[PDB]
C-alpha cells in the first residue's frame, strides 16, 4: 500500500536537493530563494539552518566531514560546527546573471552541478545560458557542455557506465556514456520523453533496480521510468503541484522524500495547496534507492 504523507511543515518557498544522511538520520535540503541550507533531524524532529548570502541550489555530503553546496555560481564548503562557508571554486564568471541549479555527487566523489540564467518567473529566463560542471576531489572544475536552459536532475547507473541528465526545458531525460575513473561523458541520447501532463522534468534519482524516479514540476507527481525501454512504469501523485525533487532515505533507503515549492502559486493556488513548500515522504513503493555518494575533496 503506497502512502503519501506530509512529514515536515515548514512552508519553504522552493524546497530542493533532498539528500539523506544515514550517519545523522537527517534530511539535508535547500530552500533556494530563502538562502538557507537545511538539516532536518528526523529523530528529534528539529530543523537547523545555515543562512548563506546568495540563492543556494543544492547541498551534498562531504566525505572528510561536513557538507558542500552550490551558492550562486560557487561550489562552497560548509563546516557545520562553526557554520563556516567558503568558496572551493567558481564557474560562469563571464555570465552576468547565472546561478547553479541541481547537483549531485558521482560514484567517484565528484560534485556534478549545472547552471542556468536567473529566472524572473518559473521557466522564464534567457535561454541556453547554463552549462554542466563537475568539481573534482582536487578542487579543479571540469566543464562538460553548454547551451543548457535549466540544469536539473541527474544520477548514475548502478554499473557506473551511464550518466542520466535533465535539462528541464528540453522535456526529456537524457543519457551519456560515463567513465568512472576520469569522470568523462559522451554519446548523449534521449531516454525518456515527458508527456504533456507530466509537465516539467525536475529532480531525479535512481532506484536499486536501475529505474529512474523523476519529480514533475507543475505535474504534482513523481514518475518511475525505465531508461532502457523509454517507458513510464509508475506514477504517484501528491497534493502539491510544484513537486521539485526526490531522493531515497530512511532505513535501507526504502522511503522516498519529495520536496516542493509554493513560489509561483497564485492566491487561489496556495489555498488549494495548503502543504505547498513542505516535505513529503512516500512509503510502500516496493523498491529501495541507494545511498548518496559523498564529495571526495
Ligand atoms: Ca530542480
Report d(CA 172, CA 204) in Å as an integer.
12
**Angle, vertex CA 113, rays to CA 12 and CA 147, nearest 5:** 110
Give the CATH number of domain 1-297.
Answer: 2.120.10.30
22 is in an annotated binding site: no
Domain boundaries of the chain, sorted by first residue: 1-297
Place of cell 549531485: 104
Whether 202 is a known active-site residue: answer yes
11 is in an annotated binding site: no
Report d(CA 212, CA 281) in Å as an integer.
17
Give CA torsion, residues 99, 103, 106, 112, to 10 deg. -10
**CA 123 to the chain's CA centroid:** 16
**Cα dist from 154 to 9, 53, 168, 211, 212, whole Å:** 26, 26, 11, 13, 10
Contact by Cβ (8 Å): 135, 109: no
In the set 202, 241, 252, 263, the catalytic residue is 202
C-alpha cell at 294: 559523498
Rg of the chain (C-alpha set): 17
C-alpha cell at 141: 572544475
101 is in an annotated binding site: yes
Cα(150) to centroid of ligand 1, in Å?
Answer: 8
Report d(CA 292, CA 195) in Å as an integer.
28
Cα(132) to centroid of ligand 1, in Å?
Answer: 14
Instruction: Categorise residue 259: left if φ over 0, alpha if ψ from -120 to 50, beta otherwise.
Output: beta
| Experimental resolution (Å) | 2.0
Contacts of 146 (CB under 8 A, 6+ apart): 128, 130, 131
**Nearest-CA neighbor of 173 among 156, 145, 193?**
193
Amino acid at each position: 500500500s503506497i502512502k503519501v504523507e506530509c512529514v515536515l511543515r515548514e512552508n519553504y518557498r522552493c524546497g530542493e536537493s533532498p539528500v539523506w544522511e544515514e550517519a545523522s538520520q537527517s534530511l539535508l535540503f535547500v530552500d533556494i530563494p530563502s538562502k538557507i541550507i537545511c538539516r532536518w533531524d528526523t529523530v528529534s524532529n528539529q530543523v537547523q539552518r545555515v543562512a548563506v548570502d546568495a540563492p543556494v541550489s543544492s547541498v551534498a555530503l562531504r566525505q572528510l566531514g561536513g557538507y558542500v553546496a552550490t551558492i550562486g555560481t560557487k561550489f562552497c564548503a560548509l563546516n557545520w560546527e562553526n557554520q563556516s562557508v567558503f568558496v572551493l571554486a567558481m564557474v560562469d564568471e563571464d555570465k552576468k546573471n547565472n546561478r547553479f541549479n541541481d547537483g549531485k555527487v558521482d560514484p567517484a566523489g565528484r560534485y556534478f552541478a549545472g547552471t542556468m540564467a536567473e529566472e524572473t518567473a518559473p521557466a522564464v529566463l534567457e535561454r541556453h545560458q547554463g552549462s554542466l560542471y563537475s568539481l573534482f576531489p582536487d578542487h579543479s572544475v571540469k566543464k562538460y557542455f553548454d547551451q543548457v536552459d535549466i540544469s536539473n536532475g541527474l544520477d548514475w547507473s548502478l554499473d557506473h557506465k551511464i550518466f542520466y541528465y535533465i535539462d528541464s526545458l528540453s522535456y526529456t531525460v537524457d543519457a551519456f556514456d560515463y567513465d568512472l575513473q576520469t569522470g568523462q561523458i559522451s554519446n548523449r541520447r534521449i531516454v525518456y520523453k515527458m508527456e504533456k501532463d507530466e509537465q516539467i522534468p525536475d529532480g531525479m534519482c535512481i532506484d536499486a533496480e536501475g529505474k529512474l524516479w523523476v519529480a514533475c514540476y507543475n505535474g504534482g507527481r513523481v514518475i518511475r521510468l525505465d531508461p532502457e525501454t523509454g517507458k513510464r512504469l509508475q506514477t504517484v501523485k501528491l497534493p502539491v503541484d510544484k513537486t521539485t525533487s526526490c531522493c531515497f532515505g530512511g532505513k535501507d533507503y526504502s522511503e522516498m522524500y519529495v520536496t516542493c515549492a509554493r513560489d509561483g502559486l497564485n492566491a487561489e493556488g496556495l489555498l488549494r495547496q495548503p502543504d505547498a513548500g513542505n516535505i513529503f515522504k512516500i512509503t510502500g513503493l516496493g523498491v529501495k534507492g541507494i545511498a548518496p555518494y559523498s564529495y571526495a575533496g
